[PDB]
């Protein structure tokens, strides 16, 4: 997973 600061979300 990544950190999105933009969405305030992790990504898969």
Do not use: F
């Given at each position: 997973k990544?950190?999105?600061p933009a969405t305030g979300?992790?990504?898969e």
């Open positions: 990544t950190w999105n979300k992790w990504t």
